Every structure is written in structure tokens, then in C-alpha cells.
Amino acid sequence: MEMEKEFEQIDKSGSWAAIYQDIRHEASDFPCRVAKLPKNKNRNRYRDVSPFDHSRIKLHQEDNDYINASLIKMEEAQRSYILTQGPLPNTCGHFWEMVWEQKSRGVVMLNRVMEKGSLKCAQYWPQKEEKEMIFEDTNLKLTLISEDIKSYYTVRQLELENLTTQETREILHFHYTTWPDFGVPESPASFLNFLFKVRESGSLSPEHGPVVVHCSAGIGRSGTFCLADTCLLLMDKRKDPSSVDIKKVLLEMRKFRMGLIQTADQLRFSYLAVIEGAKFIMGDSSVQDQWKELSHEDL
Ligand SMILES: CC(C)(O)CCOc1ccc2cc(O)c(N3CC(=O)NS3(=O)=O)c(F)c2c1
Ligand SMILES: [Cl-]
Ligand SMILES: [Cl-]
Ligand code: NA
């Protein structure tokens, strides 16, 4: 593939940092006026990570519609994602309000609550069936229904209830627990095994609202996940691996949220994941079982 040839050339010349810096230099800069309003200071986890105004998710409330969340609409791939920061103690109600209003079926969490000795995300979902969470400010209730615990990720089935109408929805929560802050997954196989677990759930399908993807800031790990998924979907459309330009796809995504993919090694890993995933897209369905084995998800 042209993607494989490009990877080989960058590796041989040792120019991942330069390629990655080129992307940062060419990336879109759009205003984030709402994110920077004084009233929204305590709704942002990081001073330097904000949603662009043009693509921010608006909460459907009159008081304050702001959440640090972006709609990434990949027009050619025909898939949308919401990328958001790890909720703060005061924005967990907003987070589930967004999930409800945007009709999302899945939440993909790529971080842990504590990383490198600091708190990176609130405990925004219940870990025990009998201890449900009630978000009084947004009139929502959230109950853990079941979970499937694997070695490096956990899938949870949640029930989200609109307390105003008593309507309920199933939310699937995919928690990747071994992807370090500013780091990469253990292998392409472990990443792809997890990505296709998300896909198989239906959470990425167009009948539902956009999947909500987050890490701590919602850009490094979240960007890597969504770049790989979109590239594999583009390749699927006409079964043509050489028709995917990873750097171009990443620049397109960065029109919708700043800073997606935060290290040169996350960019390199993205290539690895797409190159390996291409084996499945191009017709070797058996490689999915191989990824499951190589991921050691039982062990
Ligand atoms: C957009 C810009 C100009 O580059 C400024 C980026 O400023 C920041 C500030 C704090 C961060 C904290 C994170 O934990 C983080 N993560 C690393 C990962 O791999 N995933 S992440 O959770 O998104 C970030 F990327 C951050 C980026
Ligand atoms: Cl740690
Ligand atoms: Cl970490
Ligand atoms: Na190869």
C-alpha cells in the first residue's frame, strides 16, 4: 500500500517528529469564544483545550448551554463523533444531558480516573448496580445494569432515565484501562480488538446519535481512536487502502476540535493501527480472532 510505503519512508528517515510538527503547523485555528467566557471557567478541565465555537455541542437548556465537547462530522466517511473532556465533578450532569440530547448509544472512555498520581476525570458512572447516580441538575438517573470485565478493558451496560418523562435508554460504556496519558496502546491488536468491540455493539452506527469519545482532555487518545476508525471506514467504502491519506484525514478532523493526536508516537501508532486493520477491511475476517488472542483480553 501507499500507506505502508509512506510509513517505511518516515521510519527510515526518522522524521515522525517533523511530520507531526507539520500537522500542528497546518492545523485549523478557529475561535473558542464561548469556552473562554468567565462563567464557563469551571466547566473546562484544561486552560488550553477548548471546543471551537463552530462545532461545540450545545446543551438544550436556557441557563448555560456550554460543555467542553465537539462534534466531529466526517462527511466523506459518513460518521460523526462527539469528543469531550473527562467530566468534572460539576459537569457530570451536563455530560449525561449531552448523551441524552444527542441520542448517543455508546460512550468510549480511553483514560482512567487517576493517572500519574493526579485526577484526570470524575467518577461519572456507577460502578455498583445497587448504587445508581442521580443528576439533579439535569433531571437524569443512571444505573449500572451489567458489565463484562476483560484484562485491559471493561464493557458496561447502563440505563439512562429521563426523570421528567420516565423514558429510558441503554448506554454501552467501553472503558479502555491500559492506554497511558500521552502514550499509545500496547499493540495494534489490543487497540483494534477494542475498536471492533465498540463497532460490534452498534454504538457507531448511523441509526444512533454520535458515539461520545473521551479521555482526559478529549484530544490525544480520543483523536487517535477516531482517526483510526475513520480511516478504516474510508478504506471500506471502495476497498482501496491507497485511497486513504492519514495526514489529510487528521487535518480534516482538526477542523472540528483542536489538538487531536498529541504526540508523534500517537501519529505513528495511528498508521500501525490502520495498516493492520486494513487486513480485516480487505477481506481477511479471520484476523479479528487473531487480534483477540494477541490482546490477551481474558488473561
Ligand atoms: C491543543 C494544544 C494547543 O495542543 C494544547 C494541548 O494542551 C493540553 C493540556 C492538557 C492536556 C492533558 C491531557 O491529559 C492530554 N491528553 C494526552 C493524551 O494522550 N490524551 S488526553 O487526555 O487528551 C492532553 F492532550 C492535554 C493537552
Ligand atoms: Cl499512572
Ligand atoms: Cl497515564
Ligand atoms: Na505492512
Residue numbers in the entry: 1 to 299
Give verbatim excerpts from the published study on this entry.
PTP1B and PTPN2 are two of the most closely related members of the PTP superfamily, sharing a high degree of catalytic domain sequence and structural identity, but differing in their non-catalytic N- and C-terminal segments. PTP1B is targeted to the cytoplasmic face of the endoplasmic reticulum (ER) by a hydrophobic C-terminus, but can access substrates at the plasma membrane and after receptor endocytosis. On the other hand, we have shown that PTP1B levels are elevated in intratumoral CD8+ effector T cells isolated from human melanomas or syngeneic tumors in mice, and that the inhibition or deletion of PTP1B in T cells, or CAR T cells can markedly enhance anti-tumor immunity by promoting STAT-5 signaling. These studies have identified PTP1B and PTPN2 as intracellular T cell checkpoints, with analogous functions to those mediated by the cell surface T cell inhibitory receptor PD-1. We demonstrate that Compound-182 is a highly potent and selective active site competitive inhibitor of PTP1B and PTPN2 that enhances T cell recruitment and activation and represses the growth of tumors in mice, without promoting overt immune-related toxicities.
To gain insight into the molecular basis for Compound 182’s selectivity for PTP1B and PTPN2 over other PTP family members, we solved the structure of PTP1B in complex with Compound 182 using X-ray crystallography. Briefly, the phosphate position was occupied by the acylsulfamide ring with the carbonyl oxygen atom displacing a conserved water molecule that is usually hydrogen bonded to Gln26651. This placed the edge of the acylsulfamide ring above the catalytic Cys215 in such a way that the hydrogen-bond network that normally exists between PTPs and the phosphate of their substrate pTyr was largely maintained. The central naphthalene moiety in the inhibitor overlaid with the phenyl-ring of the substrate pTyr and the 3-hydroxy-3-methylbutoxy tail then extended along the surface of the protein towards Gly259. The WPD loop of PTP1B was closed, as it is in previous structures with IZD-based inhibitors, placing the planar naphthalene core between Phe182 on the exterior of the protein and a hydrophobic surface made up of sidechains from Tyr46, Val49, Ile219, and Ala217. The PTP1B/Compound 182 structure reveals that the 3-hydroxy-3-methylbutoxy tail of Compound 182 is likely responsible for its specificity towards PTP1B and PTPN2. The terminal methyl group abuts Gly259 and anything larger than a Gly at this position would clash with Compound 182. Likewise, the ether group at the beginning of the tail was 3.6 Å from Val49 and any longer sidechain (most PTPs contain Ile at this position) would also clash. Finally, the naphthalene core would clash with any reside larger than Ala at position 217.
